[PDB]
Amino acid sequence: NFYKDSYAASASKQDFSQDPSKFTEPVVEGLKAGAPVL
Amino acid sequence: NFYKDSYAASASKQDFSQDPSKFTEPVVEGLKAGAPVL
Amino acid sequence: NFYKDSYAASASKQDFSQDPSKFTEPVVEGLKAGAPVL
Amino acid sequence: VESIIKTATDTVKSEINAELGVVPSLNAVETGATSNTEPEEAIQTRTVINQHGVSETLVENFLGRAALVSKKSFEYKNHASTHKNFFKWTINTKSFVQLRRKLELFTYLRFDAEITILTTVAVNYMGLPDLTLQAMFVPTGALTPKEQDSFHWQSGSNASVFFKISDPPARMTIPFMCINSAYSVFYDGFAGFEKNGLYGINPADTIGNLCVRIVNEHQPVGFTVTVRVYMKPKHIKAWAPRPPRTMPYMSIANANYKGRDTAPNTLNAIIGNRASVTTMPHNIVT
Amino acid sequence: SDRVLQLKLGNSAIVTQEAANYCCAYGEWPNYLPDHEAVAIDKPTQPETSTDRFYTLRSVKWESNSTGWWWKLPDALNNIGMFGQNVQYHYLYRSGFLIHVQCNATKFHQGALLVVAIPEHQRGAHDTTTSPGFNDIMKGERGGTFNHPYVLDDGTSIACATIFPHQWINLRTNNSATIVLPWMNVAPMDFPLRHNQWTLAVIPVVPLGTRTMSSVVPITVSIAPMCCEFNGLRHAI
Amino acid sequence: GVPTYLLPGSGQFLTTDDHSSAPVLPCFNPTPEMHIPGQIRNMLEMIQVESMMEINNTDGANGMERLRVDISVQADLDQLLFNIPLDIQLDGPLRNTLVGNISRYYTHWSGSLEMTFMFCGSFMATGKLILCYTPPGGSCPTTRETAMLGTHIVWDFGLQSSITLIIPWISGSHYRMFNSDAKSTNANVGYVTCFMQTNLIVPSESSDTCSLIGFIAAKDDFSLRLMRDSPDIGQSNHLHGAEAAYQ
Amino acid sequence: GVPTYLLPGSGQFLTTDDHSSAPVLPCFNPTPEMHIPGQIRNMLEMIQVESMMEINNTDGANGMERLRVDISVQADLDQLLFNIPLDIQLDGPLRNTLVGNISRYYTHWSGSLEMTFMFCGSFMATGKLILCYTPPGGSCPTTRETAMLGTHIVWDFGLQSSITLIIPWISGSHYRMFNSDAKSTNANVGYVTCFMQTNLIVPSESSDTCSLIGFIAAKDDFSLRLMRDSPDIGQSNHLHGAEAAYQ
Amino acid sequence: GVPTYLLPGSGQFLTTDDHSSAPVLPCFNPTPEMHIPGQIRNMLEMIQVESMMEINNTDGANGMERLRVDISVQADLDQLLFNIPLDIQLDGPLRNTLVGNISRYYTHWSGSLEMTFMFCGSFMATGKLILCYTPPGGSCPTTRETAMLGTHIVWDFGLQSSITLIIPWISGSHYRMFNSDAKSTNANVGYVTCFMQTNLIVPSESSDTCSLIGFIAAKDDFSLRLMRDSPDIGQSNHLHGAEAAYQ
Numbered sequence A, B, C: 001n002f003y004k005d006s007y008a009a010s011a012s013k014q015d016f017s018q019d020p021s022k023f024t025e026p027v028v029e030g031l032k033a034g035a036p037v038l
Numbered sequence D: 001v002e003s004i005i006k007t008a009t010d011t012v013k014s015e016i017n018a019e020l021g022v023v024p025s026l027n028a029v030e031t032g033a034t035s036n037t038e039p040e041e042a043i044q045t046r047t048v049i050n051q052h053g054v055s056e057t058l059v060e061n062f063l064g065r066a067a068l069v070s071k072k073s074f075e076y077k078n079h080a081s082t083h084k085n086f087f088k089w090t091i092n093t094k095s096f097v098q099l100r101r102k103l104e105l106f107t108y109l110r111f112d113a114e115i116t117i118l119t120t121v122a123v124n125y126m127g128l129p130d131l132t133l134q135a136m137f138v139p140t141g142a143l144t145p146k147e148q149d150s151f152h153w154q155s156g157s158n159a160s161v162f163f164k165i166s167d168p169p170a171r172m173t174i175p176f177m178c179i180n181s182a183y184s185v186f187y188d189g190f191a192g193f194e195k196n197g198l199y200g201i202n203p204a205d206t207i208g209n210l211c212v213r214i215v216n217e218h219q220p221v222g223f224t225v226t227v228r229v230y231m232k233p234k235h236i237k238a239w240a241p242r243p244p245r246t247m248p249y250m251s252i253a254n255a256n257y258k259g260r261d262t263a264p265n266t267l268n269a270i271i272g273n274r275a276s277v278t279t280m281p282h283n284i285v286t
Numbered sequence E: 001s002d003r004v005l006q007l008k009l010g011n012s013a014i015v016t017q018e019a020a021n022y023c024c025a026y027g028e029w030p031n032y033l034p035d036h037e038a039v040a041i042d043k044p045t046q047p048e049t050s051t052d053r054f055y056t057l058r059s060v061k062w063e064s065n066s067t068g069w070w071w072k073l074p075d076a077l078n079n080i081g082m083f084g085q086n087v088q089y090h091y092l093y094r095s096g097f098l099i100h101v102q103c104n105a106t107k108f109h110q111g112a113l114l115v116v117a118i119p120e121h122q123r124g125a126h127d128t129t130t131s132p133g134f135n136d137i138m139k140g141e142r143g144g145t146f147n148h149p150y151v152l153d154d155g156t157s158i159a160c161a162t163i164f165p166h167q168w169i170n171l172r173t174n175n176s177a178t179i180v181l182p183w184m185n186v187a188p189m190d191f192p193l194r195h196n197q198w199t200l201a202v203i204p205v206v207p208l209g210t211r212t213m214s215s216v217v218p219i220t221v222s223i224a225p226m227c228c229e230f231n232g233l234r235h236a237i
Numbered sequence F, G, H: 001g002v003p004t005y006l007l008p009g010s011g012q013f014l015t016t017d018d019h020s021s022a023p024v025l026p027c028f029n030p031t032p033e034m035h036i037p038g039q040i041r042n043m044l045e046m047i048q049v050e051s052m053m054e055i056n057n058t059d060g061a062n063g064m065e066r067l068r069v070d071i072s073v074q075a076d077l078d079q080l081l082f083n084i085p086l087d088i089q090l091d092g093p094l095r096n097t098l099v100g101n102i103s104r105y106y107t108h109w110s111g112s113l114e115m116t117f118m119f120c121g122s123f124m125a126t127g128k129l130i131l132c133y134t135p136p137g138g139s140c141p142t143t144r145e146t147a148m149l150g151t152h153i154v155w156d157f158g159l160q161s162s163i164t165l166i167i168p169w170i171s172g173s174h175y176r177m178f179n180s181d182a183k184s185t186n187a188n189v190g191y192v193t194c195f196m197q198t199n200l201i202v203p204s205e206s207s208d209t210c211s212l213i214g215f216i217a218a219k220d221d222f223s224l225r226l227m228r229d230s231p232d233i234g235q236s237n238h239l240h241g242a243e244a245a246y247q
Ligand SMILES: CC(=O)N[C@@H]1[C@@H](O)[C@H](O[C@@H]2O[C@H](CO[C@]3(C(=O)O)C[C@H](O)[C@@H](NC(C)=O)[C@H]([C@H](O)[C@H](O)CO)O3)[C@H](O)[C@H](O)[C@H]2O)[C@@H](CO)O[C@H]1O
Pocket: D260, D263, D264, D265, D271, D272, D273, F090, F091, F092, F180, F181, F231, F232, F233, F234
């Protein structure tokens, strides 16, 4: 980026962080594999 | 700046120095917080 | 390559590896020079 | 819970299961959590080292595309006796459905916007003039020009970009300029302190006005000039994904819906009908 | 173990013996506004127990032909108790919410309610280009009803509404749903009378049915604001 | 100066290009970031959430009635209850789902899918169902004896209300693709069928017709490629108010 | 040579661009710098100086009469004396001030404002006033009992001639903005009202009508964003002598 | 900015240029590589495989009859059986071979060639042949006494069914070239002739006319230069279905 303002830079396609559980498992008490959910 | 004359350079947007008091408090004797001005 | 995707790069004309025998001599038992083939 | 994912997850080989008290295939949808049954627990799997990448679905790439947001045609001529050689456009991302639907897959979005302006001309034949245009960015509800030649175009502080039709499309980046930490793609509220304001329109989410004029004085003949504006968001952060739009859009000012006349995407039926729940469409007839 | 639960805030408490764990929206939990995110500089008032407690709204009746109900927050509570008073006397407010939806029946009854907390649920009007009016949106404590739950009254779909924080009340399984909501907005605080951060929607995807004695089956909503903060004190609006 | 030459492609405007560009407002200070709940960084996170399949997409079924499949107490044995076409890239029960909608913004896909069904009858209602996934090759099975030969799960109604049928990624090629031909060897996923394993059995005071709600989602071994415009939205005219933005 | 390609934006003239350019006079030696009093480096320094508000912007008030508010000895109690609209981005008592003028070259603003009033009656005149700042939400208060509930300062006339009412930055959003709609939730700042706390009291030989001069300024927690052309100046024709510059 | 200037060649599209170019699909993840049998990295690998020469390219010889040369029991001595023109860059017995086809995509060539002949008569058939390579300069030899003076191999039929005649690279210049003139000093390779050394001799129950199949290939001292379009394929009209690709 040769511009003085950082927002002028090219895209940032390097954020590979993920946390699906905030959407897939937003339950307060974690569910263990194989164990009855209820 | 690839030009030989320095005045040809791009802008200089890095001078963050300030001294508002030369406009806001140009009084010879400094005014203390809370104390009666007069 | 100034592009972010490697597939955008210029050609790769540096692979000088060869193995003609996979086409010229795909026989299980190698043939020795001078010796009767059968 | 958070981690770095660069490829789809691998599969581990699994054996036969016959354990009392262990029922991985049973779940409870009522909890609100999605099933956590793994393939390895549902069937016997083999080991697979999965090398499939996941970068094309990164939000930056998903939304990182220059999409058409504005298209305006006007007559360039002597308007002695309508857009008189210039126009004003209140910027919005709700007029073209492809970009709109994608942005609306999210509740909040923070991004800088790369703007590209494409211009084409047609004679109303003796050749096409290489005109110079001026696109001036005028803030929200701010003072816009009323004539092709008003003093307002002097653009003392407003940013203006001058470009020729023969040059590549003009381009510049408008920073994330919301007064908040992110733009509200949806806004369940009223933009004013009184009760008669507009619903669902948060002024804070309107980038501004784009005033475009042909700088050249009119020619002896008339031309049709079309200006297309494209926007590409970058340096994107997105929050709270949402249900995709199904009903056709009706207005740029709201989410009003009506649905198609017949399925698919009719208010009464989103998916097209099949004869019955035991009728297999596209069944293989060998 | 994950079927029984007691919620206690302020002078209020609620228990359920037929729960289904409980949801923490986006895996978050309510909290007070930190100094590094604050904007309004006046010292805020944090009422605690007088506002962070359960407020039970009037019940609604689940009928065989019901389309669903909704309550917008904070609108639904803007005129209830001390939370309502603080809201009326302050220009700015901030809070999370603990939602508990209740509905019991019989082991001979069937039905399934989707209980979802929708952020920024901007309603759309049906078959017209005119945007919804103030009275179509601000229902207060009474809440409103869905005209076309199939598309969430916004041209999208209830089918994909599970992308939002939610639980279900499936009569044969549980009799209550619990969802904890953190402050959800693009600003650290907001004017409570013109913007609703969340919309609680309760929709019967599977209608109420039985062949046993017919009885009125109510659905009740109890909501407890959490970590309330108010700024910009003045007179009551 | 520096000697240079322009390459083919010079001056073009590629909508997917990636370059820096002139800042319109120099020295502009963007609003500070604030933590906001629910940040999503990869669309794959969204398709892992299960959503409702419109299995009852039939004439006579209106609105939400299309989102549930009713099963009744049977008089005959081994009864077929319903089937579900599997191309998440074509119109059908799977199209208007989170995984279906997002996948349709792409052309290639790979990974396991999961179908979860929640029984919504009364507590006194019991039953066993068999859900089968039949890999492609032939005609959809119409009898339990045939469907049973494929991938399946026998579901027993009880306290845990839902069952999950995993549709494992079983493909010759790394990815499957959409090409508008549902019978193409690189598109057809196979079939899902549901039969009574035993029967739905309920007492006199319980409804004798109960509903199931089917959900679907991608597992984390999923991958999508080749972005394209979605076929699920389009316009013929200007939207209302669009032109007023110029007045 | 070096292979290159032109990007979109090539050849354009952006008035806010920032690049070096060819020196017209090579080897030119600019006049040496000399220290000069009053250097200003950030416009925020200028808006921190308080200037006079035109509170008496009413028909019949001419010139400087508009810059002072006259208060008289009252016959009734708790009397409302005057109010002041607060949008420093719209026409009103605050527009032609240092903070108002400079702020109007921008679109977004944030920070605390300060209003200082100087009592200019005679030494023998006494009194107490209450200045109130009411955050937005409702109609402007018209009674002291209501205004008193907001942010305020009770002012006692005496040797120290001036009082300061701080209008703290109280906003939901980081910044407020101008959009020509004074009632917008992102624009309205609220109100400032002034009532008699007691009464203006003076002896027979002192004037029984006295003036206050109100000043306003930004504090150093102020910030302005998004430069735009000011609405406070404009032209329809060439200025006199402009064309003569070509003769 | 950087001062630059465009060179001649700027803006041109050279079909053999080598530069990087804008990726159409950013962040696209290509299918993982998999090992596949038979990878070829240099076309020289392909021309080293021997293929059948169409020696019997005569009127009356149809299809595969053109790929074999029949020899019969002779009544006279030292009989000439057949000859083979040698320009692998012109139409003749060597053109439709692996080495011939690939070489014709080039203009210059260098290296030794090898011709292998397989006798396909019956086991009871015997014989001796002499295969001769005559470097260029004169007319093709028509008698064994003359051909015998060049490079040659005397072949005795037996258990090992095939013989190889090496056509060593014998040229004044490093490379030979095609220029459509078969008699050019930089093109003509010379000749290959085959005579009976003794005679084909067979018993009463064996066929008295037997076939030979001749193969040719390049050795690894081969080199090809100057790519050009092959003269072996061409079109006058659109192929069937080509225009339908636009419908
Ligand atoms: C093109 C092809 O290969 N086959 C055509 C059949 O598919 C078609 O029958 C109809 O197909 C419809 C397909 O569903 C969509 C789709 O394209 O996937 C669903 C989209 O959401 C929808 N988009 C919008 C904005 O409404 C889209 C759109 O309605 C159509 O493209 C417009 O025609 O359709 C669906 O399954 C219908 O229920 C089905 O009847 C037949 C019709 O004669 O023509 C085939 O060529």
